[PDB]
Amino acid sequence: PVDFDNLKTMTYEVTDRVARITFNRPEKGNAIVADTPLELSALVERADLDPDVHVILVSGRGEGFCAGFDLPYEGTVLSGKTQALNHLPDEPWDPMVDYQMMSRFVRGFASLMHCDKPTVVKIHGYCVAGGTDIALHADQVIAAADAKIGYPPMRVWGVPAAGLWAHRLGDQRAKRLLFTGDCITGAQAAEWGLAVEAPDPADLDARTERLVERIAAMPVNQLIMAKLACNTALLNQGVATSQMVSTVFDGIARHTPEGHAFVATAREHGFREAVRRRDEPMGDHGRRASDV
Amino acid sequence: VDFDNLKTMTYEVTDRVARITFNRPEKGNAIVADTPLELSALVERADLDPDVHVILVSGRGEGFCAGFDPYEGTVLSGKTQALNHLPDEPWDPMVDYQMMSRFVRGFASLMHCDKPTVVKIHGYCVAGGTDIALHADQVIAAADAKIGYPPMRVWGVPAAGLWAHRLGDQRAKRLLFTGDCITGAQAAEWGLAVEAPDPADLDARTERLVERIAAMPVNQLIMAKLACNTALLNQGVATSQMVSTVFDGIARHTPEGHAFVATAREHGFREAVRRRDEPMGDHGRRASDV
């Protein structure tokens, strides 16, 4: 059970009518850990139920919003032992054991889509890999013009479990990114309709505060109705099915020969080196742009 | 939810079957604030237990469920919700939606969970009871069980929004345009239930069904449910549920809804219900002759 007085991965503060959910592992690029979806969904529910909250603002401390997945469950399918056993390469694995695990990460992230009140994600720096599985669920994404946004583990070791790229970008632009693992800038993300605006990084915080203040100025009842109305169209696109099959695919990506070889490199040399070997050949390692 | 101090239902695993059994028979297993919370917590517990293959939901007493029967400083507080049911001031349908949608969210655990869910209906499953039951993957009903949504007559619209998905347009409308109930035998004929044993055989036929499902590997079962649910959810279930939950709030706040409550306060709820149904000839356990 989440303890609001001892949160592990993020902070919560209500200022006037804005509930601020702020990731708090800056030293690790706010990388996603087992408590991340639990804390996110609990805090989103708390904001939903607080009559003084009109809007939820999600952001991260440090150099970027979120770098993706980090490299009481005993006797459950989610136990560390069960999951580790299910990642051995030389024995048959169980994709449904994997599904039960990864679908619950996505379930927690999807709180930003299915909650009653408006959600805003502010992206500075980078929002890559699993970070996008969080961000794309938000109602409004506002990104620094120079932010790096995409899903590089398409190259090896993941398929976006949230399954939202086609819903947020359309077929052609989603395929452009998922067939390459390439990232786009925040500026491109606004041009492509992934973000609602892309202020220069110096103006990001001010434009974000401006956006959330305008939303918070609206009555809660009006906001909830607008969201229900818009979500009828969104969910009718088959979002639930995209997320299910993508979560299955993500488990497959982590268990193919390619996926195991990436993990073997990370085990031997660290995740940083594994990521370097993945991206340096493509010219976009680090904060580098992919020139889409 | 404290698994050692449950208020509305019990939880027991026998072999590979997780039994979630309602435990307020003196109140017809009527739904209260804790019911959706306990249901969804126990369903999750079952999903995560590798020794569980199937979830069996049932009720103690004379029937499955008769329908609807901490949050301080939240929108769900008793004070906030009571204020929102006053007749002579404008009410807020989104304050109501935040409350009723969360009952439905809990009940929808039976649809969205990973493992198969079976509901066993004896006696009755009416009104809010059907908002729970129709989410289950398999419904098995005594041939003489009474099933339907009588508060379509006044004071509700089925918040789960599942009748058209489970019966198709014509049969759903037949029940929702009248508040009539069907027997368990008719539920099987109409595909709402997978079978309708005589009441003396229901428990044995239910154990038989759950045993056949429990004999399958968990991974196979989860995949079958995922594959089938793609088609189910593509019917627009999310939308049906959302709009119906808004409509249920409306039903509770129309002049008709408020008049029903005024009758319940003067004569008691049991008598307000008798006066609703007796003119339609189907009060209590009486059949509707659909």
Side-chain angles (χ1 to χ4, degrees), chain A residues 1-27 29-70 72-73 75-80 82-84 86-270 273-286 289-292, chain B residues 1-6 8-26 28-68 70-71 73-78 80-82 84-269 271-284 287-290:
Chain A
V2 168
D3 179 357
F4 300 147
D5 298 316
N6 287 281
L7 294 164
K8 305 179 184 50
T9 73
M10 61 190 73
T11 63
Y12 181 85
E13 171 189 39
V14 178
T15 56
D16 290 304
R17 299 168 177 200
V18 182
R20 296 174 188 276
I21 298 169
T22 314
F23 303 155
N24 198 22
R25 301 171 87 241
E27 69 290 349
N30 303 313
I32 298 160
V33 290
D35 294 302
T36 300
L38 296 175
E39 290 182 353
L40 177 65
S41 65
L43 293 174
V44 167
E45 178 78 350
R46 184 181 180 187
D48 253 4
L49 294 178
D50 185 345
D52 295 320
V53 173
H54 296 221
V55 57
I56 299 164
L57 176 59
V58 188
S59 64
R61 290 176 181 85
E63 289 174 342
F65 171 80
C66 184
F69 281 87
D70 192 294
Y73 283 157
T76 79
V77 66
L78 300 188
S79 78
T82 296
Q83 295 289 324
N86 204 47
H87 277 85
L88 295 172
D90 295 339
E91 277 177 51
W93 67 287
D94 189 320
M96 292 304 104
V97 165
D98 196 86
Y99 176 87
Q100 292 201 277
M101 177 275 303
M102 189 48 64
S103 67
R104 286 174 167 76
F105 279 99
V106 178
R107 186 176 73 182
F109 305 163
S111 72
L112 295 178
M113 179 176 287
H114 295 300
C115 62
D116 302 332
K117 291 173 190 174
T119 56
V120 181
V121 161
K122 179 192 89 182
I123 298 162
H124 77 292
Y126 53 74
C127 178
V128 294
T132 60
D133 296 311
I134 297 172
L136 277 47
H137 285 97
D139 297 316
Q140 299 283 271
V141 173
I142 178 163
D146 67 342
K148 174 170 169 173
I149 304 174
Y151 199 92
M154 274 305 317
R155 292 165 181 178
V156 59
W157 197 75
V159 174
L164 298 179
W165 293 94
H167 299 289
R168 300 312 202 181
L169 284 180
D171 190 59
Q172 191 156 184
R173 292 161 173 179
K175 288 171 173 170
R176 175 62 179 79
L177 303 188
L178 298 193
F179 288 173
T180 60
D182 291 348
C183 293
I184 54 173
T185 64
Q188 294 178 301
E191 280 309 320
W192 285 8
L194 186 67
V196 76
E197 83 173 85
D200 289 331
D203 303 322
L204 180 63
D205 288 345
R207 293 293 293 184
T208 298
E209 291 304 314
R210 178 180 181 280
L211 176 56
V212 304
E213 163 182 36
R214 295 185 77 82
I215 298 174
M218 311 279 274
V220 166
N221 51 210
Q222 292 295 104
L223 289 173
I224 293 174
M225 285 192 292
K227 182 167 182 164
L228 295 178
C230 290
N231 278 2
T232 69
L234 178 60
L235 301 180
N236 200 60
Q237 297 185 357
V239 168
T241 294
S242 297
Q243 194 153 90
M244 183 277 287
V245 78
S246 297
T247 295
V248 173
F249 290 160
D250 183 59
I252 293 168
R254 294 183 269 94
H255 295 80
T256 48
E258 295 86 349
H260 285 290
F262 175 82
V263 169
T265 300
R267 191 185 184 275
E268 185 73 359
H269 300 292
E273 167 66 15
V275 166
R276 181 196 70 77
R277 301 185 188 188
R278 181 193 73 198
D279 295 349
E280 187 178 301
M282 302 294 81
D284 64 359
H285 178 45
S290 309
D291 185 27
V292 175
Chain B
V1 175
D2 179 359
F3 299 146
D4 287 328
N5 194 12
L6 297 165
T8 77
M9 60 185 73
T10 55
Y11 182 87
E12 180 188 33
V13 179
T14 56
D15 291 314
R16 295 162 172 211
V17 180
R19 303 176 185 272
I20 300 171
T21 310
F22 302 149
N23 204 26
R24 301 176 82 240
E26 71 294 352
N29 301 315
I31 299 164
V32 293
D34 284 320
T35 305
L37 300 177
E38 297 184 349
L39 184 60
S40 52
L42 290 172
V43 164
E44 177 77 354
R45 182 178 181 185
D47 256 2
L48 295 182
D49 184 345
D51 292 327
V52 168
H53 295 226
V54 64
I55 299 160
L56 173 57
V57 183
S58 66
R60 287 176 180 90
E62 297 301 313
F64 176 81
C65 183
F68 286 89
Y71 289 147
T74 77
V75 70
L76 297 190
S77 80
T80 296
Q81 290 296 316
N84 205 47
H85 278 81
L86 292 171
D88 297 336
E89 295 175 35
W91 66 286
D92 190 312
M94 290 305 104
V95 165
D96 194 272
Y97 173 86
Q98 291 201 274
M99 177 275 299
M100 185 53 63
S101 69
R102 285 173 164 77
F103 278 101
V104 178
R105 183 178 76 180
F107 303 160
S109 70
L110 300 171
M111 177 177 289
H112 299 297
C113 60
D114 300 329
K115 288 177 194 176
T117 57
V118 180
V119 159
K120 179 197 86 185
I121 296 168
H122 73 295
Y124 49 81
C125 177
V126 296
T130 65
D131 293 315
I132 298 173
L134 273 49
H135 281 101
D137 298 311
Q138 302 282 270
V139 176
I140 182 168
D144 72 336
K146 181 172 172 168
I147 303 164
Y149 198 94
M152 276 305 317
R153 295 161 178 182
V154 57
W155 215 64
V157 172
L162 296 176
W163 290 95
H165 299 289
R166 299 314 198 181
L167 289 179
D169 193 59
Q170 188 153 205
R171 293 163 169 177
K173 285 170 176 169
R174 174 61 180 82
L175 302 190
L176 301 189
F177 288 178
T178 59
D180 288 351
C181 294
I182 56 172
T183 62
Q186 295 176 299
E189 183 195 336
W190 285 6
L192 187 67
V194 67
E195 82 173 89
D198 290 346
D201 301 325
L202 175 69
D203 282 357
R205 292 290 294 185
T206 300
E207 293 303 320
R208 176 179 181 280
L209 178 57
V210 301
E211 283 180 25
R212 293 187 79 77
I213 298 176
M216 313 278 276
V218 166
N219 48 207
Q220 294 295 108
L221 293 172
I222 297 176
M223 287 191 287
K225 178 165 183 169
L226 293 177
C228 291
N229 276 5
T230 70
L232 176 61
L233 297 177
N234 194 238
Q235 296 188 359
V237 172
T239 289
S240 294
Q241 196 151 88
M242 186 275 293
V243 309
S244 298
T245 295
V246 170
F247 289 157
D248 182 59
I250 293 171
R252 284 184 279 94
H253 294 82
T254 53
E256 292 88 345
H258 285 291
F260 177 78
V261 169
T263 299
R265 288 181 180 160
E266 191 180 356
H267 308 278
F269 181 82
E271 179 64 6
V273 162
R274 196 187 67 76
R275 295 179 182 200
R276 179 195 71 196
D277 294 347
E278 185 269 354
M280 307 313 300
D282 63 2
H283 172 60
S288 310
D289 181 32
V290 174

